[PDB]
Amino acid sequence: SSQIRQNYSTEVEAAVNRLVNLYLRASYTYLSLGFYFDRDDVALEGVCHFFRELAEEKREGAERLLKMQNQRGGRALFQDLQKPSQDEWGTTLDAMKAAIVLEKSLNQALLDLHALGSAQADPHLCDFLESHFLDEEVKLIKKMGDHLTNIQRLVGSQAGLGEYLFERLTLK
Amino acid sequence: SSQIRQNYSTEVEAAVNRLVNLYLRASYTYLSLGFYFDRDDVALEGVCHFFRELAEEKREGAERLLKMQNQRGGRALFQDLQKPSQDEWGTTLDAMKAAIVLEKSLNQALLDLHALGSAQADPHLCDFLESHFLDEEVKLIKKMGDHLTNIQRLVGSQAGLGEYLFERLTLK
Amino acid sequence: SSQIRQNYSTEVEAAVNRLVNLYLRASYTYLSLGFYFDRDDVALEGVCHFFRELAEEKREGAERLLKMQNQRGGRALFQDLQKPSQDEWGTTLDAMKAAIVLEKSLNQALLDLHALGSAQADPHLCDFLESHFLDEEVKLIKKMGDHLTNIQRLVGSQAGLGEYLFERLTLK
Amino acid sequence: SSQIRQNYSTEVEAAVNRLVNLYLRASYTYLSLGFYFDRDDVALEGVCHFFRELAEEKREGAERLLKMQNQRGGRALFQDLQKPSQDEWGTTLDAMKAAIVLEKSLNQALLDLHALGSAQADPHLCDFLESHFLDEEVKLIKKMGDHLTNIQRLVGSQAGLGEYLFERLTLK
Ligand SMILES: [Cl-]
Ligand SMILES: [Cl-]
Ligand SMILES: [Cl-]
Ligand SMILES: [Cl-]
Ligand SMILES: [Cl-]
Ligand SMILES: [Cl-]
Ligand SMILES: [Cl-]
Ligand SMILES: [Cl-]
Ligand SMILES: [Cl-]
Ligand SMILES: [Cl-]
Ligand SMILES: [Cl-]
Ligand SMILES: [Cl-]
Ligand SMILES: [Pt+2]
Ligand SMILES: [Pt+2]
Ligand SMILES: [Pt+2]
Ligand SMILES: [Pt+2]
Ligand SMILES: [Pt+2]
Ligand SMILES: [Pt+2]
Ligand SMILES: [Pt+2]
Ligand SMILES: [Pt+2]
Ligand SMILES: [Pt+2]
Ligand SMILES: [Pt+2]
Ligand SMILES: [Pt+2]
Ligand SMILES: [Pt+2]
Ligand SMILES: [Pt+2]
Ligand SMILES: [Pt+2]
Ligand SMILES: [Pt+2]
Ligand SMILES: [Pt+2]
Ligand SMILES: [Pt+2]
Ligand SMILES: [Pt+2]
Ligand SMILES: [Pt+2]
Numbered sequence: 001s002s003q004i005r006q007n008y009s010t011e012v013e014a015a016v017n018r019l020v021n022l023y024l025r026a027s028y029t030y031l032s033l034g035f036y037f038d039r040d041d042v043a044l045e046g047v048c049h050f051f052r053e054l055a056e057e058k059r060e061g062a063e064r065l066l067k068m069q070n071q072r073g074g075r076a077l078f079q080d081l082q083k084p085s086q087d088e089w090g091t092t093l094d095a096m097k098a099a100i101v102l103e104k105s106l107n108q109a110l111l112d113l114h115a116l117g118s119a120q121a122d123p124h125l126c127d128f129l130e131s132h133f134l135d136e137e138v139k140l141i142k143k144m145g146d147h148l149t150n151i152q153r154l155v156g157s158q159a160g161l162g163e164y165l166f167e168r169l170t171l172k
Numbered sequence: 173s174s175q176i177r178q179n180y181s182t183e184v185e186a187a188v189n190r191l192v193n194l195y196l197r198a199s200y201t202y203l204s205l206g207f208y209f210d211r212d213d214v215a216l217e218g219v220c221h222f223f224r225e226l227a228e229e230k231r232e233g234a235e236r237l238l239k240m241q242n243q244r245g246g247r248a249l250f251q252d253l254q255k256p257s258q259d260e261w262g263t264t265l266d267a268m269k270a271a272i273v274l275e276k277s278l279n280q281a282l283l284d285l286h287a288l289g290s291a292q293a294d295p296h297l298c299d300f301l302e303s304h305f306l307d308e309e310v311k312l313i314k315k316m317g318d319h320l321t322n323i324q325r326l327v328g329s330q331a332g333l334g335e336y337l338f339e340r341l342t343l344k
Numbered sequence: 345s346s347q348i349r350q351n352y353s354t355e356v357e358a359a360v361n362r363l364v365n366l367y368l369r370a371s372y373t374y375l376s377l378g379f380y381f382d383r384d385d386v387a388l389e390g391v392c393h394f395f396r397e398l399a400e401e402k403r404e405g406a407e408r409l410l411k412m413q414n415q416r417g418g419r420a421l422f423q424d425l426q427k428p429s430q431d432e433w434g435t436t437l438d439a440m441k442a443a444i445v446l447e448k449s450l451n452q453a454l455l456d457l458h459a460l461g462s463a464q465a466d467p468h469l470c471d472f473l474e475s476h477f478l479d480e481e482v483k484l485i486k487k488m489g490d491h492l493t494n495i496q497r498l499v500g501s502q503a504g505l506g507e508y509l510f511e512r513l514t515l516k
Numbered sequence: 517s518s519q520i521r522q523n524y525s526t527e528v529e530a531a532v533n534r535l536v537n538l539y540l541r542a543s544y545t546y547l548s549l550g551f552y553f554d555r556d557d558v559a560l561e562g563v564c565h566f567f568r569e570l571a572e573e574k575r576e577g578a579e580r581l582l583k584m585q586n587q588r589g590g591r592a593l594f595q596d597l598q599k600p601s602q603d604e605w606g607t608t609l610d611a612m613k614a615a616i617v618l619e620k621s622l623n624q625a626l627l628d629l630h631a632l633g634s635a636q637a638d639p640h641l642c643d644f645l646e647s648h649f650l651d652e653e654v655k656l657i658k659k660m661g662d663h664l665t666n667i668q669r670l671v672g673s674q675a676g677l678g679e680y681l682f683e684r685l686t687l688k
């Protein structure tokens with residue numbers, strides 16, 4: 001219906017709105033992860049900073065999707081944001097595992113939207129995702145994987161010491 | 173139960189968590205307001221920028237409350253974020269009226285928490301709100317009031333022209 | 345037949361030549377639009393400057409397509425350039441409507457060439473269009489849409505005043 | 517009796533003098549803690565520096581209280597300073613626990629004086645404490661809590677190694 005809208009399906013428009021919800025949900029999860037690591041009885045500030053930065057990045061991702069939605073003449077529709085899956089996130093290992101699962105879920109949503117765009121013959125959409133989201137997700141998942149490996153190596157024996165050292169020497 | 177917690181009631185802890193929810197809800201409302209004014213069929217970029225900046229400020233407010241919650245040995249608890257009250261926000265006048273109602277609701281929540289802190293004899297809480305929230309809200313509400321007055325003066329006659337001029341000469 | 349040519353169909357080569365013609369035609373239309381707004385009896389210099397800049401951008405687009413045609417070992421073939429569709433372009437509203445129709449026609453030609461490249465399995469072509477044309481067109485069409493909305497809002501009542509203000513406060 | 521004194525009760529004046537004694541006692545405790553960690557058979561210089569800085573901060577606190585006492589037309593009265601509670605402070609964990617207990621005792625004295633000021637309707641006093649003492653104490657107690665958590669995590673196994681690493685990588 002927009003004067004500008006061209007080659008932009010209702011199916012893609014709706015999936016973009018869903019993806020915005022997913023990115024904002026992810027941002028909210030990272031906010032909870034960050035503040036958990038800032039608790040006085042957890043106290044791993046490099047971990048808190050890692051997750052707070054991710055909270056920012058996912059919010060930024062949502063805003064880029066909303067910008068794009070408006071550029072194509074789609075209509076942003078916001079839904080309720082579901083609270084994060086946990087109130088307490090365990091150890092740095094637990095938290096990093098939860099983060100990689102979240103990232104893989106966002107990546108899968110990106111890949112699903114890419115496939116939809118390809119089926120709807122919407123190359124602007126495909127370029128947009130390739131240019132601003134797909135590579136960023138692959139890089140982030142690789143970093144997280146690297147972190148998991150390092151954390152697991154450290155907490156095999158002397159879990160406390162290992163968690164401290166990872167925060168001090170990798171994250172901080 | 174925290175090793176650090178001192179003079180910090182369960183009632184205040186819970187009300188802080190509720191206030192975080194309110195600020196994040198407000199931020200989400202301002203995100204929707206901003207992107208509405210960025211629609212091709214609305215196209216008032218100074219208005220979009222005004223509301224996007226407010227979205228940032230309310231998120232920052234929530235983060236300051238969460239920082240404080242952890243400093244006092246309280247435990248952050250996140251809930252679902254309710255979607256904004258509207259999908260479409262009407263004219264700049266409608267939007268500014270919706271914003272002032274939202275701000276007044278946040279202000280009332282601040283005043284209610286202040287009164288609770290006073291009843292619980294929690295001066296750190298009272299100082300915190302006075303120092304970082306109460307004055308900021310009064311300033312913002314005054315600015316919004318000033319904007320409403322200017323918008324109403326402009327759209328009495330020639331509503332379209334007036335909306336354009338307010339965006340160009342006040343907001344931009 | 346070129347020593348360099350690889351995976352570059354005759355169908356794509358020909359469509360590239362047609363697209364060059366379309367971009368040069370568009371540039372010529374924008375030259376006519378610009379000089380119309382520079383007439384002493386029209387005299388909207390911000391509008392003239394807007395369209396003259398677009399004339400440059402479309403010429404640049406044509407030159408990028410010709411560069412690419414030579415990089416792939418295709419052969420540039422020039423045709424006659426049809427004169428613009430009008431000698432006089434009416435108001436700023438009329439002109440902006442004519443511009444968005446032109447841009448949408450260029451966008452459709454880009455999307456058609458993209459689909460051809462996809463059918464001919466020519467990813468260099470698809471990347472080229474994605475990287476240098478598709479996003480630029482979406483951005484431009486969005487800007488034009490925003491302008492139309494602003495012009496329409498202004499000329500509902502007091503058409504003359506509104507046209508002056510849009511030129512002074514948006515375009516200039 | 518002072519020419520300047522206004523709305524400044526004898527009860528507050530006396531409690532201010534007691535608080536000065538408490539801050540100077542605290543400073544003296546931190547001096548003993550610092551020099552203990554500088555012993556050749558303890559030798560944790562980051563710990564020594566942490567506590568020596570706190571000794572300075574508490575002396576500064578006392579001096580601010582004495583300044584204020586004179587600004588309100590009260591009369592400073594000094595008492596004997598009791599020696600610190602220990603001659604030897606054990607491990608970094610023991611020492612940090614002793615420090616947080618001391619800080620909580622100072623915080624409680626601040627809160628008690630705040631309540632007295634509120635009962636005596638002395639807002640200059642309440643502002644003074646809020647502005648210069650209450651927030652500083654909450655921040656310090658949170659930091660100490662964070663340190664305790666980190667030290668405990670480190671000395672669960674390999675107590676010696678953990679104490680070294682905390683001094684090197686957090687305190688130094
Ligand atoms: Cl559709
Ligand atoms: Cl930090
Ligand atoms: Cl849920
Ligand atoms: Cl309680
Ligand atoms: Cl903008
Ligand atoms: Cl709702
Ligand atoms: Cl061929
Ligand atoms: Cl000029
Ligand atoms: Cl013709
Ligand atoms: Cl008295
Ligand atoms: Cl030293
Ligand atoms: Cl003694
Ligand atoms: Pt940080
Ligand atoms: Pt960082
Ligand atoms: Pt694709
Ligand atoms: Pt881009
Ligand atoms: Pt990007
Ligand atoms: Pt902006
Ligand atoms: Pt701004
Ligand atoms: Pt108060
Ligand atoms: Pt503050
Ligand atoms: Pt502040
Ligand atoms: Pt110009
Ligand atoms: Pt220009
Ligand atoms: Pt493609
Ligand atoms: Pt390129
Ligand atoms: Pt380019
Ligand atoms: Pt030192
Ligand atoms: Pt220092
Ligand atoms: Pt007070
Ligand atoms: Pt002061």
Ligand SMILES: [Pt+2]
Pocket residue numbers: 647648649
């Ligand atoms: Pt101060």
